[PDB]
Amino acid sequence: VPVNISDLSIPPYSRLYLIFEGKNNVLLRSKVHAAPLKITSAGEMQLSERQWQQQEHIIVKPDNEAPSLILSEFRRFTISSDKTFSLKLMCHQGMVRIDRRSLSVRLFYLREQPGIGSLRLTFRDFFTEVMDTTDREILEKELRPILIGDTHRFINAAYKNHLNIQLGDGVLNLADIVAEYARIQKEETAIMTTTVTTDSGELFPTFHPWYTDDLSGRYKSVPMARKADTLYHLTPKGDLQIIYQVATKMVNQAMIVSLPNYRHEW
Numbered sequence: 603v604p605v606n607i608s609d610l611s612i613p614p615y616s617r618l619y620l621i622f623e624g625k626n627n628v629l630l631r632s633k634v635h636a637a638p639l640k641i642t643s644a645g646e647m648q649l650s651e652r653q654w655q656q657q658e659h660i661i662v663k664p665d666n667e668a669p670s671l672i673l674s675e676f677r678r679f680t681i682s683s684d685k686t687f688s689l690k691l692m693c694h695q696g697m698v699r700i701d702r703r704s705l706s707v708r709l710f711y712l713r714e715q716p717g718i719g720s721l722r723l724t725f726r727d728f729f730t731e732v733m734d735t736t737d738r739e740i741l742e743k744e745l746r747p748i749l750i751g752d753t754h755r756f757i758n759a760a761y762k763n764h765l766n767i768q769l770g771d772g773v774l775n776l777a778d779i780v781a782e783y784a785r786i787q788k789e790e791t792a793i794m795t796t797t798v799t800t801d802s803g804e805l806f807p808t809f810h811p812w813y814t815d816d817l818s819g820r821y822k823s824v825p826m827a828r829k830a831d832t833l834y835h836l837t838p839k840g841d842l843q844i845i846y847q848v849a850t851k852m853v854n855q856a857m858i859v860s861l862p863n864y865r866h867e868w
Contacts, residue, residue, distance in 0.1 A: 648672040676770040679710040749784040840865040
């Protein structure tokens with residue numbers, strides 16, 4: 603039977619065969635999506651390790667009241683030991699987004715496999731119905747006073763009993779992350795950001811490094827020093843981000859450098 607290549611569904615533990623033609627070539631580009639785990643219960647629930655390893659997206663749809671999730675042996679990916687600095691970084695990396703009754707946060711973690719995974723949690727019914735329209739600048743400007751004042755107002759009291767998540771050894775509270783998102787939204791009108799694309803050509807050949815490889819003459823140096831650790835981010839949109847430390851004891855900052863749409867113009 604014919605299938606629409608636009609959408610194919612593979613059940614767990616099964617195989618799908620796609621018979622093609624013998625002539626010409628076979629050349630396709632594909633994207634995979636896991637089934638979003640819908641959580642509609644109430645009260646409390648704890649998830650085994652592989653339970654949150656398997657599915658990469660858990661969305662909670664509270665029928666009458668949101669439950670309280672408790673992930674087990676969940677080790678958060680920390681680039682630093684400062685909680686507030688880690689939250690600021692996570693918010694500046696485009697990780698947290700707000701849409702209608704939908705707060706979505708992309709939480710990373712580590713595991714024994716050589717590499718670190720991701721897990722996106724999208725809480726449905728987190729903002730009050732009155733704030734189900736924010737897509738307009740007038741509405742966000744009108745809710746700005748609530749952002750700078752009673753931050754714990756956009757979510758009604760009904761959900762305020764369950765407003766935190768128990769990870770393996772840390773606790774993440776939604777109020778802090780929404781507050782930091784509000785703060786970054788206000789300040790954009792400690793962390794330095796730089797944008798560069800096919801520019802910063804400053805006579806690279808044979809000044810500092812002499813000349814090696816078939817390198818272009820595009821010279822761009824970071825402003826200050828950095829620690830041995832570096833963090834590379836490939837945004838699902840396509841932007842590329844490089845995250846640098848500062849190598850200062852009492853001051854912990856970062857110099858994020860973004861190459862926009864790098865996956866298409868590398």
